[PDB]
Structure 1
């Protein structure tokens, strides 16, 4: 898994960006977020994830909120 931090998340529309030191930001949609219920992320949150080729370039997958 890669380790990063949520750069941006649009709480309303369910997407954002994960920043990874020395790498390009990675796009995250709510559907990638693991866990039950409403799926969301706050800026600054540490996450673990992988990158997948979506329809339109790389996107985050299997995103988990870390301490």
Structure 2
């Protein structure tokens, strides 16, 4: 479970990318976002994300994303 700001979140498509203290971004999708209702984020805002192995194309996906 990592927490970081979001670079961009396409609500029209259902995908986004988050960047933690590490460095690189993460693969996030509406099928991973963990919220109760509106699963839309805002660029510049903080949000959590649980990077998983066989979940995202590039590998690390936001299996567990949170709004912050």
TM-score higher than 0.5: yes
Structure with greater helix share of residues: 1
Q: What runs of 5+ residues in structure 2 fail to find an aligned partner?
A: none
**Structure 1 length as normaliser, TM-score?**
0.81
Residues 52 and 62 in structure 2, CA contact (< 8 A), matched pair in contact too: yes
TM-score by length of 2: 0.80
Q: CA RMSD in A?
A: 1.6
Moved over 6 A (4+): none
Please show how residues 23-42 of structure 1 align to structure 2 within 5 Å: 23-42=23-42
Gap regions ≥5 residues in structure 1: none
* Count of matched residue pairs: 66
After superposition, residues 1-67 of structure 1 pair within 5 angstroms as 1-53=1-53, 54=55, 56=57, 57-66=59-68
